[PDB]
Amino acid sequence: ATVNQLVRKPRARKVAKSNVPALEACPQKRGVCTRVYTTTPKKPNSALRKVCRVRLTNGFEVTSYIGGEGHNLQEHSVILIRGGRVKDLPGVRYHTVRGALDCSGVKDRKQARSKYGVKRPKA
Amino acid sequence: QQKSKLENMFANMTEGEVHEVNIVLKADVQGSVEAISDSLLKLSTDEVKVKIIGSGVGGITETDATLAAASNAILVGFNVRADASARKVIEAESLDLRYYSVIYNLIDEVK
Amino acid sequence: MVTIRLARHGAKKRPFYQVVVADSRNARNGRFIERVGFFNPIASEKEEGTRLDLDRIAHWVGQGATISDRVAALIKEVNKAA
Amino acid sequence: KIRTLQGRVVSDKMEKSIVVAIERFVKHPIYGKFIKRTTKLHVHDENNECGIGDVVEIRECRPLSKTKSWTLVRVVEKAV
Amino acid sequence: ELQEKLIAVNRVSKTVKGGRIFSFTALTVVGDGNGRVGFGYGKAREVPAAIQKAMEKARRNMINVALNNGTLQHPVKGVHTGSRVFMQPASEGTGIIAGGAMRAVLEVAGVHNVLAKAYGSTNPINVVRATIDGLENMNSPEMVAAKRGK
Amino acid sequence: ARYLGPKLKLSRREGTDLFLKSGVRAIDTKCKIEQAPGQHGARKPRLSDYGVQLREKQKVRRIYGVLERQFRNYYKEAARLKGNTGENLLALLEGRLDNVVYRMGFGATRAEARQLVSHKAIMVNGRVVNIASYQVSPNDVVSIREKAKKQSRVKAALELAEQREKPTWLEVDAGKMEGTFKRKPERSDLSADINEHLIVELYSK
Amino acid sequence: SMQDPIADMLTRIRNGQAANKAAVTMPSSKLKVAIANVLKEEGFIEDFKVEGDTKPELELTLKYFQGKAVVESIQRVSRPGLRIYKRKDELPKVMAGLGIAVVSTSKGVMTDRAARQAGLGGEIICYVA
RNA sequence: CCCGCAGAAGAAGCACCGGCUAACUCCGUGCCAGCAGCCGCGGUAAUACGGAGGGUGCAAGCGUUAAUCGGAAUUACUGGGCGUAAAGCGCACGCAGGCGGUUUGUUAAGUCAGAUGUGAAAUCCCCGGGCUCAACCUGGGAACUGCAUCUGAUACUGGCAAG
RNA sequence: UAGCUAGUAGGUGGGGUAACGGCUCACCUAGGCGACGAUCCCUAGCUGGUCUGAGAGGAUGACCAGCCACACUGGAACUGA
Ligand SMILES: [Mg+2]
Ligand SMILES: [Mg+2]
Ligand SMILES: [Mg+2]
Ligand SMILES: [Mg+2]
Ligand SMILES: [Mg+2]
Ligand SMILES: [Mg+2]
Ligand SMILES: [Mg+2]
Ligand SMILES: [Mg+2]
Ligand SMILES: [Mg+2]
Ligand SMILES: [Mg+2]
Ligand SMILES: [Mg+2]
Ligand SMILES: [Mg+2]
Ligand SMILES: [Mg+2]
Ligand SMILES: [Mg+2]
Ligand SMILES: [Mg+2]
Predict the structure, then answer these.
(1) How many CB atoms lie within 10 A of CB G110?
(2) Angle CA(C71)–CA(C77)–CA(C82) in degrees, nearest 5?
(3) Are B58 and B80 in contact (CB under 8 A)?
(4) How do D70-75 and D56-60 pair as beta strands?
(5) Measuring CA to CA, which residue among F83, F67, F86 is closest to residue F75?
(6) Coiled-coil stretches, from where to where (chain F)?
(7) Non-local CB neighbours of A90 within 8 Å, separated by 6+ positions
(8) Would you call G84 and D34 a contact, using CB atoms and an 8 Å cutoff?
(9) Chain A CB within 8 Å of residue B1 CB
(10) What is the total count of domains within chain C?
(11) What is the DSSP string of A9-41?
(12) In 3D, which of G29, G68, G22 has the Cα closest to residue G47?
């Protein structure tokens, strides 16, 4: 409040920690994705959701949600991981990119081809 | 990839052959990796199943040593040398680096 | 050695030279003492395009500056009274 | 005469050497509060002159030691 | 010359012995085009009943606001409940740029230029009345000639 | 850089005639004005306070056929100019070359005016201009070249051009097939139904 | 406490205007009189007066036109804890020019309008609305 | 760059449509499969999922993610609080530090005025000019809120003297 | 991170640098810096500016341009303005 106090100790600012612990100024990353489990959602909802524990290239073990209906993802064949936070499973700060590197796109999808890596059908 | 996984039509193997061994291979020449792997699948048996992961075009690399870090495997090459960045990873974590001049000495030891 | 010389700051396929007093050891577009004028070798038939102050350069020639082949041509193109 | 500041003696005897702590008033860039800044500067001097409890005039010169680029000229009064 | 509109409508619960009954509360602001700003709140069990009562109360309690041409006469501050309101004149420039709740009271008053920027509480019910108190305390350079001049 | 789809769908969505249906016959008759903008467009016309600001942005853009990025540069240019920003917005749009071609009556529609300017038929002060976005200033003469002169496309437009308002700020001429832009149009000479205070608000946030 | 006696006077006005008291008394000074002269110059207050010898006592007659107060507000701008100094065109105008501020210049205590015409500024004291 | 030839020929996709937020129905699925930036949707009338139709926004881009600021008066100098929501040390004496009643003289540090030097050019901004326009380029001016010195003013603050 | 400094602070004399100088020696004195943040630790080229913002600020140092530093790592000298 008093300006003489502010001269001794100036105004502090919060660091504002990011929601993507990978960091490195990277929009996307890749990782090994060793094991793919099926964990139940939070309290309000009820489902079985496809989730994978992605070992990143930098050396951090993390988890990531798999969007789209069904997948071939398991064991080996390194895939792209864009990130971004959506809240369903306990502690899931990332999302996998469908239709990139070795990750299959969503089959028979027509709307929203940009998301999920679906190519335009010839007509 | 989808067929081989769905082919079993069951959540697991019907018997106890589930125990398997993983290998990592990078050969300097492109002609070998496709050719010798076929011979490497000949030694495969029902009891113990062996599979190749991430066949390389040559040498060795960071993502290759990382590939052997996630799943325990032997890292072998028909002909390869260790990179400066490759030695740091292999020496730190516990792994095995073995290069073989001939395919016969390789086909024997994997067995 | 201070030198009066033309530095190119204009554009790709459309040159615009900046006559300027600078040391020979510095770069073309790099360091300089101060600006004197400008020269466009595209332009058109009009009142402006070529401008060069003789009061500025003639001082530096007295102080021991050299004149390049371009600046020698541009002084004898525009002349003094003409 | 060359420019001079209104600093005081503060330390007594450095064996033919003297320091000058210089008080001023300066505006703080952000808040605008006035804080008294103290600029201690080493000064060269002759014939072990008067010490603490004085205000001394100062001027620029060549350095006769490490730092110490100033010289004194006149001192006001005697007692503190 | 009537120039009438509504800002927003809000549902409110009573929760009696039987069960929850839901009323509707509107907010309207009106003006003649040059000064004379006025407002009305009201409530009703239906939506078109609530807005009709709001416009009914909006006619009475209408007070003069002093304008030079089509703008405010100075930058003025006003406070109501938890809403702190600053504003700038900005003479005949770009103009009438503002967000909802406070957009209605400015445009119907006659001003085509002044900048809103509402600090503190941005509640639709309390952002109105903060403006009119700010407009009321403002005074004209012609009619302050009692204190001004001699 | 152009729409290419149905022009009347743009007019039906706004609920006002944009003068893309000027051509030979005019004043609609066959319309279905508003009432079914889409399949479920017969739904009630109540619309948000944010949406009416965006609606007026489209009303101005769809007349002249300007894209949002190209239109943002004219708003950015209108802001830096002196006086009212809203009045200078429509002035810079009215200063376009293809719009001046439409006002004088060389092109029948505003889309046809850009179409004719694209093929380098229009010359200003002697020199040819391809770009429809060319800025027209006072005392700048404009005319059609010797090639493609007195054709049925341009001739039919100039005949029916007399039936419209006939703007005061420029001379129609049409005798020797030329034109002259005298001065910048006034606030009374344009706008009226389209509003400048509505369109400008959306870029403030 | 009595550290800022100029800010005391600015408090005495709004207490006087709110309470509807005509005559308000206080201890006088050099700068204290000159600020009260600027209030009468523009014509906010009715008239100033002083009575004493060893103890000067400033008596400010407060003006009332309507039931509402003449002076809308008054705030301590430059205070001992934090001072405000403005050059020539950096002097802030109060309410788009309507009313006047109090500014202490080298020649004397003047208004915001008058100090611009002189061509020199100084320490602003308070904004009289 | 200009002229000639042929012929609408070679060239429109992308997101989104429960509210926020511009733009809605049907069908399939039935807490299953999935969406999600936030509040949340789906357990048999889903404008929130998937497809289709229609529509909206934008355009050789579109969308998602990542990074910075704004919004955020949510570190608040300008421009916020501390009875009960986060927040007044349990209380007091006190050095350094911050601030100081009232009268006169002096000093001119702070402050304010004027002038000089400097604040590279480019950039930003304003009025023009040149690439078919624009981006881009460029003439001149303004500006670079700063700092130092010199010459002045003495109200206020500070130093000093007498009260 | 609250105490940190022996060439450390100052003088005299000699030597040294193109040039002032603990720059480097012998001797003498016991100071120097520091709560207005010394020292230590972590991080980072800096500025004209760019980006955002009504402004004040915040973030940032790509290209363009100035200065400094570095030239496989560490250290040293020669030639020469
Ligand atoms: Mg484009
Ligand atoms: Mg909508
Ligand atoms: Mg979707
Ligand atoms: Mg259904
Ligand atoms: Mg802030
Ligand atoms: Mg608060
Ligand atoms: Mg409490
Ligand atoms: Mg410059
Ligand atoms: Mg031009
Ligand atoms: Mg005094
Ligand atoms: Mg010596
Ligand atoms: Mg570094
Ligand atoms: Mg702000
Ligand atoms: Mg070296
Ligand atoms: Mg040498």
Answers:
(1) 23
(2) 130
(3) yes
(4) antiparallel
(5) F86
(6) none
(7) A42
(8) no
(9) yes
(10) 1
(11) SPPP------S-TT-TT-S-EEE---EEEEE--
(12) G22
Helix (H/G/I), strand (E/B), else coil: D55:
strand
Query: Edge-to-edge strand order for the sheet containing A35-39?
Result: A35-39, A49-55, A61-65
The CA distance from E112 to F196, in Å, is 11
| Structural domain that includes position E23 | 3-63
Residue F46, helix vs strand vs coil: coil
CATH number at residue G10: 3.30.1370.30
G9 and G62 housed in the same domain: yes
Structure-token match 């010797």, residue found = F146
For residue F84, give the nearest of E92, E97, E100 by CB distance: E92
- Length of chain A in terms of residues written: 123
* Domain F7-93+190-204: which CATH number of 3.90.550.10, 3.20.20.70, 1.10.1050.10, 1.10.530.10: 1.10.1050.10
The C-alpha atoms of residue E48 and residue F191 are separated, in whole angstroms, by 35
Element (H, E) at E10: strand E4-13
Chain position carrying tokens 């009271």: E105
Task: Report whether D71 contacts D61 (CB < 8 A).
Answer: yes
CB within 7 A of strand I (chain D, 39-68): 40, 42, 44, 62-68
Determine the nucleotide nearest to D33 by Cα–C1' distance. H77
* Cα-Cα-Cα-Cα dihedral sign, residues F121, F125, F126, F131: negative
* The two structure tokens encoding residue A27: 């929009």
How do the residues of chain B divide into helix, strand and coil, expressed in percent and rounded to 5?
40, 20, 40
Q: How many domains does chain E fold into?
A: 2
Way it was determined: cryo-EM
Q: Can you tell me the distance from the alpha carbon of A6 to that of A12, in angstroms, rounded to the nearest whole number?
A: 10
Query: Domain check: are G44 and G94 in the same one?
Result: no
Tokens 């002093």 belong to E66
Q: H or E stretch including E121?
A: none
Q: Give the residue from B44, B48, B36 showing the smallest Cα distance to B77.
A: B36
Closest alpha carbon to F91 in F204, F166, F169, F205: F169
Instruction: Compute the distance between CA of residue G26 and CA of residue A70 in angstroms, rounded to an integer.
Output: 86
Quickly list DSSP for chain C. Answer: -EEEEEEE-SBTTB--EEEEEEETTS-SSS--SEE--EE-SS--SSS-SEE--HHHHHHHHHTT-EE-HHHHHHHHHH-S--
- At residue A113, the 3 state secondary structure works out as coil
Nearest Cα residue to E58 out of E24, E35, E29, E101: E29
B79 in Cβ contact with B27 (< 8 Å) = yes
Rounded CA gap, D44 and D68, in Å? Answer: 7
Positions in chain I where some atom is under 7 Å from a protein CB: 9-12, 20-23, 28-29, 31-36, 56-59, 64-67
Query: Tokens 């600029």 correspond to what residue?
Result: D39
- In angstroms, the CA F38 to CA C9 distance is 56
Residue where the block lists tokens 């006077």: G9
In which domain, by residue range, is C31 found? 1-81
Tell me how crowded residue F121 is: count the other CB atoms within 10 A of its CB. Answer: 20
From the C1' of I34, which residue's alpha carbon is nearest? D40
Q: Under an 8 A CB cutoff, do E99 and F197 touch?
A: no
Resolution number, Å: 3.7
Q: Are B64 and B80 within 8 A, CB to CB?
A: no
Contacts of residue F29, defined as CB under 8 A and 6 or more positions apart, other chains included, come to none
Contacts 24+ apart (CB under 8 A), F25-28: none
**Which residues 30-69 in chain G have a CB closer than 7 A to strand H?**
30-32, 34, 56
